[PDB]
Design a protein around this ligand. Structure first.
Ligand SMILES: [Cl-]
Length: 188
């Protein structure tokens, strides 16, 4: 399917695209400020809200959520994208303890999907410069780490997913497979 990646300015955005391309998925990176009508014309079968340095630069990602019925496809937020989803849906985001990137062990408490067929525990590449501190209503925790309770989440009714870490970075164990599982929700 056509998976649209909304670029929030993050350093790893091109790795999202290259991973999907390796998997044979049709995908395009677009500016986060792309007008909604132009996004709709791309006929997205899925949308990814990429990482980026700041919640002050999320463009039309919240607008897509506001207009979710016009898209009605799976959405994955990565880091900033996970955080902006959490804020939109009524959770809380705040500064975390460790801003520097590192490999962190997570436990998947609900395989669901993005973690389908994968080990229960994974080492993932991530920062906690910011973090989802309080789960939005109508969401479920999918994964946690020793000190971060909400490493991944999903809406309980809609196919809207968030991960704090970067599956597009190869240091992340099974990162490619997480993105493949998401792509499979979108079709093919
Ligand atoms: Cl990024």
């Amino acid at each position: 399917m056509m998976i649209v990646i909304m670029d929030n300015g993050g350093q790893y955005v091109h790795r999202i695209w290259r991973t999907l391309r390796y998997l044979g998925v049709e995908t395009k990176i677009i500016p986060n400020t792309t007008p909604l009508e132009e996004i709709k014309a791309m006929n997205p079968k899925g949308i990814i809200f990429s990482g980026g340095p700041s919640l002050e630069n999320t463009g039309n990602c919240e607008k897509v959520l506001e207009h979710y019925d016009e898209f009605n496809v799976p959405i994955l937020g990565i880091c900033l994208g996970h955080q902006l989803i959490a804020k939109f849906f009524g959770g809380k985001v705040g500064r975390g303890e460790k801003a520097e990137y590192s490999l962190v062990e997570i436990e998947i408490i609900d395989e669901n999907e993005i973690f389908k067929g994968l080990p229960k525990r994974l080492k993932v590449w991530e920062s906690h410069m910011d973090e989802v501190k309080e789960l939005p209503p109508k969401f479920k925790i999918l994964a946690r780490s020793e000190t971060c309770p909400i490493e991944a989440m999903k809406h309980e009714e809609l196919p809207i997913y968030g991960v704090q870490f970067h599956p597009e970075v190869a240091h992340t164990e099974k990162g490619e497979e997480i993105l493949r599982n998401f792509a499979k929700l979108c079709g093919e």
